[PDB]
Amino acid sequence: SMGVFTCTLADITSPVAPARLFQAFTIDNHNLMPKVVPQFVKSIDFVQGDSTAVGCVKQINFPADAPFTYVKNRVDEIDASKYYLKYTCIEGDAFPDTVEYAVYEDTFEQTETGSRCKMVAHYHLKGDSVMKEEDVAPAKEGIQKMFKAVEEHLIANPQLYA
């Protein structure tokens, strides 16, 4: 349409090993996130499939607090060896007002300090749809807090996903 805005929703260096963060955020998040971060994630249900796999669809439901209610994420590519997942939001109200279509890539990279986690959004914008930092800062801030809580859980539970 008007174009694509690609932006980094999270760039987070962590002492936790990348295989473990990958499992927590992309593979087993439907179990972990409602337990560990209920203030950000009410529940996650499989709309299609019953395990994280290419083609599955997970619906993430946000608390009443949240400015949006839900998102349906279709998993299009998984490269577990590279700790990489790509999904497409096929339905939901979590978009910045002016987004026709949104694609996300969650990547975890091995570093010397531990991991570097990058979550990248590709926002396809409608005709003359203005977009500003204030439109994505709430998501950026919420994601950092979620990561913080998940990181602490994995530190406190060193064998989980090891």
Residue numbers in the entry: 0 to 161
Lines from the paper:
Here, we isolated a salt-induced PR-10 gene from the halophyte Halostachys caspica and named it HcPR10. HcPR10 formed a pinecone-shaped structure, with the twisted seven-stranded β-sheet and the long C-terminal helix forming the top surface of this structure and the curved V-shaped helices forming the bottom.
The cavity also contained several hydrophilic residues, allowing water molecules to bind inside the cavity in the apo-form structure. The entrance was approximately 5.9 Å wide and 16 Å long, which was large enough for the internal insertion of a small ligand. We determined that recombinant HcPR10 took on the structure of a typical PR-10 protein, with a pinecone-like shape and a large hydrophobic cavity in the middle.
